[PDB]
Structures are given as structure tokens and as C-alpha cells.
């Protein structure tokens, strides 16, 4: 249902129902494609909602729960590129392309990060 309400671009009832699902399953299902999926989806809704702060923390906790995942690294790199933290996003991008070969969107985002690194002149 949270995915369903995310699809119609409502972004409020989706968040509410996904949060309700997560509080229902706080105690059990620590892993096995249920907690990972719900938390990743909630973070994606927050990202589309421009509330990037809590999104950083939720994506980080998902990443520390399970690490071999290209999607989490690509989304975290996108979140960092939304802010100005290119130093901490290029490593995540490189790891994402290490994990999965093509990742065309990740390649384009990383290339844009490269042009940013060229442009910036930080000490």
C-alpha cells in the first residue's frame, strides 16, 4: 500500500502506511527482504519529499544492515549529490559500480560528480 500511494505521487498516506507497517514489525523480521525493503522504500519516499536529512540516516542504517547492494549505494550517492558532500559520495558511487557492472544512471551521476570535482577548487 505504501508503494501504491507512492506511485500516485501523494507522498503522505504512503509515508503514513509505511511507517505504520514498520512500527508493527519493529520487534521481528530483522532481515530477509522485509525490513530492508520497507526501510529502503520509506527512505525513497523521503528523498522524493526533499526531506533528505532523515533519509541519510535511514539509508545508512539499511547499508550497515546489508552491504552488498548497488541500489542503496546509488541512492546514497544521489542523496549526497543533492547536498554538497561530493567527497563522501564519490566513494559510494565507485563502490556501487564495483558491485554491479553497468549501472548506467550511476555512471551518469558519477560523471557529473567528476565535472563538479573539476569545477570546485577546495583547499
Amino acid at each position: 500500500m505504501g508503494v501504491m500511494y507512492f506511485k500516485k505521487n501523494e507522498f503522505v498516506k504512503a509515508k503514513k502506511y509505511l511507517k505504520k507497517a514498520l512500527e508493527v514489525v519493529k520487534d521481528l523480521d530483522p532481515s530477509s527482504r522485509t525490513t530492508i525493503s520497507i526501510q529502503l522504500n520509506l527512505g525513497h519516499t523521503y528523498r522524493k519529499l526533499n526531506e533528505n536529512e532523515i533519509a541519510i540516516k535511514c539509508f545508512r542504517c539499511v547499508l550497515e544492515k546489508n552491504d552488498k547492494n548497488s541500489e542503496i549505494h546509488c541512492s546514497l550517492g544521489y542523496l549526497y549529490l543533492k547536498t554538497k558532500k561530493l567527497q563522501k559520495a564519490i566513494d559510494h558511487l565507485h563502490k556501487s559500480l564495483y558491485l554491479k557492472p553497468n549501472n548506467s544512471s550511476a555512471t551518469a551521476l558519477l560523471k557529473n560528480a567528476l565535472e563538479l570535482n573539476v569545477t570546485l577548487s577546495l583547499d
Binding site: S31, E64, D67, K68, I90, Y98, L114, E115, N117, V118, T119, S121, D123
Partner: protein, 556 residues
């Protein structure tokens, strides 16, 4: 000294035996060796019905039948016998936990995944939560420290470094004098500013459990190997040293003829690029302990720079004579083949050494260098990558990628790789200059000067600065600062006087451009003076200078 040395002997005897009892070879090897350098207390919490299992578990581990040990201890409610099963369960998984990509390079064959440790980590958390006495207060003993240390290393496997520090520091508080625990603490830093922050934690927040330890050892500053901790951190990464020289002296007075200290002490010379003093310090160790093979690849690395192949060949012969399948033996032999320009065969022995530990010193990086000379340029860049993943503190691993990508047409990748290595070793003169040279492709000329001007200052000797002076003028030519081009290209002309008139090709272009510029400025007499200054070089520059000289005379 006085009773302080005597108090170390008794307690160090403990760390040598109990650590060896519960199958920790690496930690006990250091502690037992420290007894020889230094100038049967028994007790454990066990019952007769449970003591047999420890004998059962220990002897199967010694026979290297790892997995059967796990089954025979399927249930164990002992506080710290559970560690022995869990340790065997961890290693049984690790030997088959080889990453697919990394495996192709380390073998060349060219042909349940991780959920075990997830259950392994959860078991430790479940056991500790349901255990009678936690880490808090003056409770706990040696056994619980092993559980937390084992919990910490599994946490580092998933790169949960932030929580890994808390586990390791918590284990060391319960039981000190465990060397293997601190080695894993080294790999958690991967940064410079946290080390002082971690140092602040030890000086203020950290506290020892005086119940287990002996007298004058709960205090941090009277502890002996907290100095060993400070010694190790400030050699892996220099940064800013705090009391580094003073505490080193005290540790040298204690532990006479301790080989590890001398090897560490002499390694400082290699890190300072003082090769002549490094060999003398290394040689004394060889005489004292000929059968010690640890950190001998550094001896081969130093001899490689000196290119003393005759001396190096005998070292390989001597090393391989007594042992032929330890990682340092194959690494030295692989280093030998490189000296013979047989870079195509050095990979084989580097490959063999890696399959022994798969977490070595900088043997991954030396493998990458040998590929570069073969112009593969693609095995090397991925071989260099593996060294980054294991030890992100390695200067050479990052530099190899940036150097390799410089040959590649896309130089934009090399900027980031050089930037990381720049923070690790800012003191190197080469990395700043190489970063600036690759950074000129970016088109942001302003930041290159800040890098370029730092390269000359860090380059020490002035004679090598003549080459980079010409690069400064060339970049300034891209901007409307042709006057700034003159002053710096004048500076390299002055260095020629300092360099006893080497009149190299770099100043040949420097002299001709200045005559041309002064001619454009109407200063014919001045430009005529530098016209005869180009008395050597290629024929074209001689002809052009004479044309400038002929031109200048007409206008006078």
C-alpha cells in the same frame, strides 16, 4: 624500573599462556617472544563435566579439523568456552569466503554467501544479553574479552567500523596485554584526525579493570604497551606526534634485544627514506635472529632501491633455504625476479604469497607495479583497487591508480585518487606536482598554482625546481599574466647560477623566450645579452638565438 619490570614478567607470563590456551596463535606468539626480550600461574572457571569439552575442543582445533569442533560443542553454557566454538565457526566460513573478482587475480584460473556471520553475530549478541554478568562494573574476566574481541572483528567484516571501535575498546578495558586485539584496532582508523580523538578517549574516558590486571597496570601511563599502541599508530601514519620520542626511549630501555622493536625502529628509517642507515639497523637483526622471517620483505624492498642484486640474491637464497612457503619468503623471491627485469614471472610468486594470508602488507601494490611494466594497464588498475579495499591507508595503492589513469586518456578520474593520497602523505614532493600536472586538464588554473606553489616548497632542493618553474610560466601564459611568466622564468635562470650553469634544455627554452619577450618590449640590449647565453642545445635553438642576436644588434 625496579619492581615495575618484575611486575611485567609475572603478568606477561599470563598473557602468554592463557592466550595460547584458547587458540590465539598470533597474540601468544608476541607475548611469548616478549619473555625472551625482557631482561605456572593457573586458573579457570570450569567443571569436570565441562573441562573434557575444552580438551575435546582444543585438540580437534590443533588437528585443524575446524568444523567437527563446532558440532561437538553445539550447546555450551560456559561463559567463554562458547568463544572457542564460535571462533572455529568463523574461520570455517572464512576459508571459503573468497570474493569472485579478487579470486581471479589471486589464482588466474579464470572460471550461504555471507549469511553465516549474520547468524554468528546474532549468536554473540544473544549470548551476551542472556549472560549473567555484563561488562559493567568490576565483573567479567579474561574470557569475556575474547567474546567481545571476536564480536568486534566480525563487525569489521561488514565494515561496521564505527561500532567496531566500541567493541574492541570494550574488550581491551576488560583484559589488556592482548596484542592481536590491538592489531585489528589499527585497521579501524583509516584517517588521521580520529587518532587524536581516539587518543583523547584513552587519556580521559577510557578506564581499565584493575581486578584482573596486576598492580601499576590499571593506570594508562604506567602501562607498557599503551606505548606499543602509540608506537604503531605513529608509524602507519605520521600526522602530528604527541610524546612519540619520549615514550619510545622508555620502551627501548626495557625489553633489551627485543627483535620486534629493532625491526620497528629500523622501519622508521625506511619511512624516512634513509636507506644507508636502514641497512645497518636491519643487518644487526639478521645476525641476532637469523631464523626470524617477519618483516624481512622490507629488507628486500630497501635492497631493491639500492639495486644490490648480488647482496639481494644471497638474501633470497638464505631466506628460501630455511622455509619456502611463508608469505615473506615468496614476497622476497618475487621482489628478486623484478630486479632481473623478469616482471612477467614476479607475478607468479607475488600470486603465491597472497594466497597465504590474503591480508598482507603492501604485497598487493607490488603486484600491481609489475603489471604496469607489462603494459597491461588493466590488471594493474584492478590489482591496485584490491589494496585500497583492504588497507585504505596505503599511499602506494592510491598513487598507482592515479599514475595508471594518467596514462589513460581520461585524466579526470586521476584527480580524485590523487586527492585521497594527497591527504595521506602531504609531505611527498612528487604527489603535489603530479596532482597539479594532471589538474591542469581541468581548466581551473587558479587551484593548480596553490598546488604548484606547494610543490616547489616541498621539493626541498632547488635544482630540481628548474623543471617545474617552466611549468609555472606555461600556465601563467594561459592567463593575462605574461609579466608573472617573466619573473618565474627569470627565477629558473637564477637557479642556473646556483646549479653552476647546467644550461639544461629547460633553461634553453627559458632563455630564448625571454629574449623574444624583451624584443617585443623594445629592450634589445637586454635581449641581446641572453642571446649568447644559449650556447648549447639543439641546432634550431642555436639558429633562433643567433637570429635574435643578429636582430638585436641592428636595432642598437
Amino acid at each position: 624500573q625496579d619492581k615495575i619490570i618484575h611486575d611485567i614478567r609475572i603478568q606477561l607470563r599470563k598473557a602468554a599462556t592463557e592466550l595460547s590456551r584458547w587458540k590465539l596463535y598470533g597474540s601468544s606468539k608476541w607475548a611469548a617472544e616478549a619473555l625472551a626480550g625482557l631482561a605456572p600461574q593457573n586458573g579457570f572457571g570450569l567443571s569436570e563435566t565441562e573441562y573434557d569439552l575444552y580438551l575435546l575442543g582444543s585438540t580437534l582445533f590443533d588437528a585443524k579439523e575446524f568444523d567437527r569442533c563446532v558440532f561437538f560443542l553445539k550447546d555450551v553454557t560456559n561463559p567463554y568456552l562458547k568463544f572457542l566454538k564460535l571462533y572455529s565457526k568463523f574461520l570455517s566460513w572464512d576459508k571459503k569466503s573468497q570474493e569472485s573478482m579478487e579470486n581471479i587475480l589471486t589464482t588466474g584460473k579464470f572460471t550461504e554467501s555471507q549469511s553465516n556471520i549474520s547468524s554468528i553475530l546474532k549468536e554473540i549478541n544473544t549470548f551476551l544479553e542472556s549472560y549473567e554478568i555484563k561488562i559493567d562494573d568490576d565483573e567479567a574476566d579474561l574470557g569475556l574479552a575474547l567474546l567481545y574481541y571476536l564480536r568486534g572483528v566480525i563487525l569489521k567484516q561488514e565494515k561496521n567500523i564505527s561500532k567496531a571501535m566500541s567493541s574492541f575498546l570494550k574488550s581491551l578495558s576488560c583484559y589488556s596485554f592482548n596484542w592481536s586485539c590491538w592489531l585489528e584496532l589499527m585497521d579501524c582508523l583509516q584517517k588521521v584526525d580520529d587518532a587524536l580523538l581516539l587518543n583523547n578517549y584513552l587519556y580521559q574516558n577510557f578506564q581499565f579493570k584493575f581486578s584482573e590486571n596486576l598492580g601499576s597496570q590499571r593506570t594508562i601511563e604506567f602501562n607498557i604497551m599503551i606505548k606499543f599502541f602509540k608506537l604503531k599508530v605513529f608509524e602507519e601514519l605520521n600526522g602530528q606526534l604527541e610524546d612519540y620520542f619520549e615514550d619510545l626511549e622508555f620502551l627501548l630501555q626495557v625489553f633489551p634485544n627485543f627483535t620486534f622493536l629493532k625491526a620497528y625502529n629500523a622501519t622508521i628509517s625506511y619511512n624516512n627514506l634513509d636507506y644507508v642507515t636502514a641497512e645497518s639497523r636491519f643487518d644487526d637483526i639478521v645476525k641476532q635472529d637469523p631464523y626470524r622471517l617477519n618483516d624481512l620483505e622490507t629488507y628486500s624492498n630497501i635492497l631493491y632501491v639500492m639495486q644490490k642484486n648480488s647482496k639481494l640474491a644471497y638474501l633470497a637464497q638464505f631466506v628460501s633455504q630455511i622455509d619456502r612457503f611463508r608469505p615473506e619468503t615468496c614476497c622476497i623471491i618475487a621482489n628478486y625476479y623484478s630486479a632481473r627485469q623478469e616482471h612477467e614471472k614476479s607475478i607468479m610468486y607475488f600470486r603465491r604469497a597472497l594466497t597465504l594470508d590474503k591480508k598482507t602488507t603492501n604485497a598487493w601494490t607490488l603486484m600491481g607495479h609489475e603489471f604496469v611494466e607489462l603494459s597491461n594497464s588493466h590488471a594493474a588498475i584492478e590489482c591496485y583497487r584490491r589494496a585500497v579495499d583492504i588497507c585504505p591507508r596505503d599511499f602506494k595503492a592510491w598513487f598507482g591508480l592515479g599514475q595508471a589513469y594518467a596514462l589513460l586518456d581520461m585524466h579526470l578520474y586521476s584527480l580524485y585518487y590523487f586527492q585521497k593520497a594527497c591527504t595521506l602523505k602531504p609531505w611527498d614532493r612528487r604527489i603535489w606536482q603530479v596532482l597539479g600536472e594532471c589538474y591542469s586538464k581541468t581548466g581551473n588554473k587558479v587551484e593548480a598554482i596553490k598546488c604548484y606553489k606547494r610543490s616547489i616548497k616541498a621539493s626541498q632542493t632547488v635544482d630540481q625546481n628548474t623543471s617545474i618553474y617552466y611549468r609555472l610560466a606555461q600556465l601563467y601564459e594561459e592567463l593575462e599574466d605574461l609579466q608573472e611568466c617573466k619573473k618565474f622564468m627569470m627565477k629558473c635562470v637564477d637557479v642556473e647560477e646556483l646549479l653552476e650553469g647546467i644550461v639544461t634544455d629547460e633553461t634553453v627554452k627559458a632563455r630564448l623566450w625571454l629574449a623574444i619577450f624583451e624584443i617585443k618590449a623594445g629592450n634589445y640590449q637586454l635581449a641581446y645579452d641572453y642571446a649568447m647565453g644559449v650556447s648549447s642545445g639543439t641546432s634550431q635553438e642555436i639558429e633562433e638565438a643567433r637570429m635574435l642576436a643578429r636582430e638585436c644588434r641592428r636595432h642598437m
